[PDB]
């Protein structure tokens, strides 16, 4: 039944950007919704907000741009697949920003609040009184992942307005995650995650010296891998009960600091010792499914 706050074996995986970058490495979203081990999928990315822009790599081939915004896609296959995945018991979030987000956020709190209301009208419940375009039609996401990686002015105000709308909503639970890099504090989402409660934070423990590649097996004194710093911060954050996922590259081509074998098992056994630990995150689905046997290694490390 999707995200499980009481489990230490959650696995969140990004889908949409085809990191593996071959013609066949990213199937449609629902191909990956029969995996008993993957209970959260983040759709990557809404890479523009004001104005809105969607990029789903070659999944875009089965979409049609909206007539008045060529960078915003109408995606009936992703729509159908979100509904299928949710019927199959998966939590499907939309990931906001990503490494190709260049708009730099909003000049005022008011502009950030208006942008949040537009994202909610585009991707949350269908609003009968709204003219906004809906990339996923009558599909409704299960919440939002904040993956901003450059300075994003007034992201805290944007996040607070979107959280206001999800907190007011009926129907189902909406979740909030953020994906800071492991360097502490995080420049891009630091203000957001110090202001707005998250359900979990999926830290990118890669592309940085604090990543899982810097973990020292055989000891619980860790000079580089900084999970402990993140747990200490989490306990006084706006949601003091927020959970952490350990985010890793799903293949050597997915990011710097890929780990496997005993390094991978050991860093997960260390991380499992912490009360905030709730599982793993991986970048990304295309890399994971190409990297034969790697998913089994991660599942076996979390057991």
Residue numbers in the entry: 19 to 321
What did the published study say regarding this structure?
To elucidate the molecular basis of its enzymatic activity, the crystal structure of native Chit33 was solved at 1.12 Å resolution. The crystals belong to the P 21 21 21 space group, with one molecule in the asymmetric unit and 50% solvent content within the cell. The structure was determined by means of molecular replacement using the co-ordinates from the Saccharomyces cerevisiae chitinase 1, ScCTS1, as the search model. A short and not well-defined α1, a bent α8, and the presence of two β-strand insertions after β2 are widespread features of other family 18 chitinases. Moreover, the short loops connecting the secondary structure elements are responsible for the definition of a tiny TIM barrel, which diverges from the bacterial-type chitinases embracing large βα loops, which even include a full chitin insertion α/β domain (CID). Furthermore, three disulfide bonds, Cys51-Cys103, Cys81-Cys93 and Cys200-Cys228, are detected in the Chit33 polypeptide chain. In particular, the longer β1α1 loop makes a deeper cavity in Chit33, conferring a more tunnel-like appearance to its active site. A TRIS molecule from the buffer solution was captured at the active site of the native crystals, making polar interactions through its hydroxyl groups with the catalytic Asp165 and Glu167, as well with Gln222 located at the end of β6. As shown in the Chit33-NAG4 complex, Ser118 presents a dual conformation in the free enzyme that is fixed upon ligand binding and orients to make a polar link to O6 from the sugar at subsite −2. Structural comparison of the wild type and the complex with NAG4 Chit33 does not show significant differences, apart from a visible reorganization of the Asp117 and Arg274 side chains that approach the substrate, enabling direct polar links.
